[PDB]
Design a protein around this ligand. Structure first.
Ligand SMILES: NC(=O)c1ccc[n+]([C@@H]2O[C@H](COP(=O)([O-])OP(=O)(O)OC[C@H]3O[C@@H](n4cnc5c(N)ncnc54)[C@H](O)[C@@H]3O)[C@@H](O)[C@H]2O)c1
Ligand SMILES: NC(=O)c1ccc[n+]([C@@H]2O[C@H](COP(=O)([O-])OP(=O)(O)OC[C@H]3O[C@@H](n4cnc5c(N)ncnc54)[C@H](O)[C@@H]3O)[C@@H](O)[C@H]2O)c1
Ligand SMILES: CS/C=C(\O)C(=O)O
Ligand SMILES: CS/C=C(\O)C(=O)O
Ligand SMILES: [Mg+2]
Ligand SMILES: [Mg+2]
Lengths: 345, 345
């Protein structure tokens, strides 16, 4: 279990640190290879190297079997050359490993229905994972331009691009509730039809996982009227861009949300939240997102599903017992983490 | 006020009839040109003409200043040649008038917050109109195809296409709460940038209406966390296809939802709901959608905004006093309509 740890900026190191306490506790009690090293990333890296993705860090990432990322960015770097801003650090990092699968789970833990924008009965049981294709589609298609009278972008997927992201979604569902929904616009766009026929075929290699197809519009509705019926959801880039964002508001607090990015290279696992300069150093950031990213790490990077569910279950109990300030309670970062640890023990 | 009335099938004529009672009442009390004629459309037209969009109806549409549509379709026509199915009637009708602007309002009437999938506090006050470009974008772009190893669609807007739909949204906002949000993916797609710069420029011709720009993902979130802050929302075809569907689940009952389609030709105003064969002839269909389409007609086709708000206000009072079965109450089509009429008087 060789992890490169990239705490970054703002609340990044605070929440990262909380995740490590959890990973460490887990190491001592269960004995894992846990070996890890802290590299400077983003702002922290600029401060000390003139650039956000240094070669020592680049070296660490490569060699590591997984990256636990914090968050990067902040005022003290916002007026800087695009090529060198902390955000372009993220972009290089991701590109550097050809991560084509973004996993974002939206979960409403038992008792936390009160937080959802949805009504109690609709929010109960929600636990959906959105799997987004990262490297293809309209965001990257050629030809693409703007003339004065018109503009054009091209949505483009090839068969191997659809296949790999599909495969990730199926692996994921097998570790979960064995049900996949694939989202396209197949009744209108050929790229849609193409997606659907291709995923249908991949699904044939996972006879344990059921597969079902919906239209992106239909799906935007279901995510609001009845999100609790879904398990894994997989889709193309732009739609994933919309849908995970849609799914994400569901638990009703930013501090709850983890992320994994998978592909060829080193998997990266990060909280969705940014570096939160307005609260950095206050010891109040909710570390759930980070801890849940470690959980996701154990799961997707190390096939350690049971340990992942153990963290999740501890976190779910902590969120009830000593909820953080963003959940309406009082537990600062260290104190909440201590509650997670009481439940791992 | 020359209206071609196209009741169609299933609950179509039932709910259409309710809207006419309202329009008629409104005619006698306020004196409008109300003149109208019932043409057979969809199934009804097939039954008696071998085809769903007959030339008498085609004639009526053209010559009429507005079409009040019911709904078409049903089992007794589903196994028929594409070219002749009731749905292709809809398609020809719409095409025949080059309707490029689809307006769908999602409204949570006071006291009906209980119906929303959203929580009471978020649902209160929601009254958003989604304006969708109908005739351009990726749904229609060339080149477009599927090979065996890949598939491609092209998203394409020209400056006059963006302009006309923008204009419709601005006209609409002036009649409402004078605030427009334009939704694109401008930080990634040139078509996005192009949309945004173009709408920005149109906005300059409506100095009474404020204009604001969001990303389709951001907007999917806002529609769920805080839909009550919006007035008119305008966007491209595919995004509109997603977003209005998203907005539409918000009032929390299909029977509440109206639609207008505007362009060069005759404006058509219809309920979003289909022909509902499973309840046709039972005298229970909620006629709110239809009545609200007449309301939309008065408004968008005849600039009669005050009369439109009068219908809306009556409908809102009826929905509280004698709610229909789909709202959890008992009022069948005639009885609910009678409650609308008591409040128009
Ligand atoms: O701003 P930005 O976009 O750079 O960063 P961000 O998007 O992560 O922060 C957005 C807002 O949410 C708060 N926030 C973010 N993550 C949080 C966490 N884990 N716990 C508690 N509050 C959190 C921040 O203080 C900020 O006010
Ligand atoms: O089926 P379909 O897709 O052809 O038609 P549809 O989509 O309009 O109907 C969907 C379902 O909702 C019900 N429904 C639709 N419109 C309604 C209304 N105005 N009042 C009460 N119930 C309504 C129907 O009975 C059906 O069960
Ligand atoms: C393009 S991938 C973005 C994320 O993974 C995030 O915002 O956490
Ligand atoms: C393509 S436009 C669709 C509608 O207007 C509707 O479903 O009511
Ligand atoms: Mg399968
Ligand atoms: Mg303006």
């Amino acid at each position: 279990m060789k992890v490169a740890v990239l705490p970054g900026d703002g609340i990044g190191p605070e929440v990262t640190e909380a995740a490590l306490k959890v990973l460490r506790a887990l190491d001592e009690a269960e004995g894992l290879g846990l070996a890890y090293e802290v590299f400077p990333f983003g702002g922290a890296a600029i401060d000390a190297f003139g650039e956000p993705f240094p070669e020592p860090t680049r070296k660490g990432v490569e060699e590591a079997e997984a990256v636990l990322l914090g968050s990067v960015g902040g005022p003290k770097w916002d007026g800087l050359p695009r090529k060198i801003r902390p955000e372009t650090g993220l972009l290089s990092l991701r590109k550097s490993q050809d991560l084509f699968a973004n996993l974002r789970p939206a979960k409403v833990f038992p008792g936390l229905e009160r937080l959802s924008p949805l009504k109690e009965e609709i929010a109960r049981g929600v636990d959906v994972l959105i799997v987004r294709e990262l490297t293809g589609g309209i965001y990257f298609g050629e030809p693409r331009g703007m003339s004065e009278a018109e503009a054009w972008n091209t949505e483009r997927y090839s068969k191997p691009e659809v296949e790999r992201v599909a495969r990730v979604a199926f692996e994921a569902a097998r570790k979960r509730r064995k049900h996949v929904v694939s989202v396209d616009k197949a009744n209108v766009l050929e790229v849609g039809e193409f997606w659907r026929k291709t995923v249908e075929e991949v699904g044939r290699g996972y006879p344990d996982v059921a597969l079902e197809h919906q239209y992106v519009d239909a799906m935007a509705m279901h995510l609001v009227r009845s999100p609790a019926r879904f398990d894994v959801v997989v889709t193309g880039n732009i739609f994933g861009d919309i849908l995970s964002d849609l799914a994400s508001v569901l638990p009703g607090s930013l501090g709850l949300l983890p992320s994994a990015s998978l592909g060829r290279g080193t998997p990266v696992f990060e909280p969705v939240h940014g570096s939160a300069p307005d609260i950095a150093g206050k010891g109040i950031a909710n570390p759930t997102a980070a801890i849940l990213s470690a959980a996701m790490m154990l799961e997707h990077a190390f096939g350690l599903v049971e340990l992942a569910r153990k963290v999740e279950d501890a976190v779910a109990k902590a969120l009830l017992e000593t909820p953080p300030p963003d959940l309406g309670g009082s537990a600062g970062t260290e104190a909440f983490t201590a509650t997670v640890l009481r439940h791992l023990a």
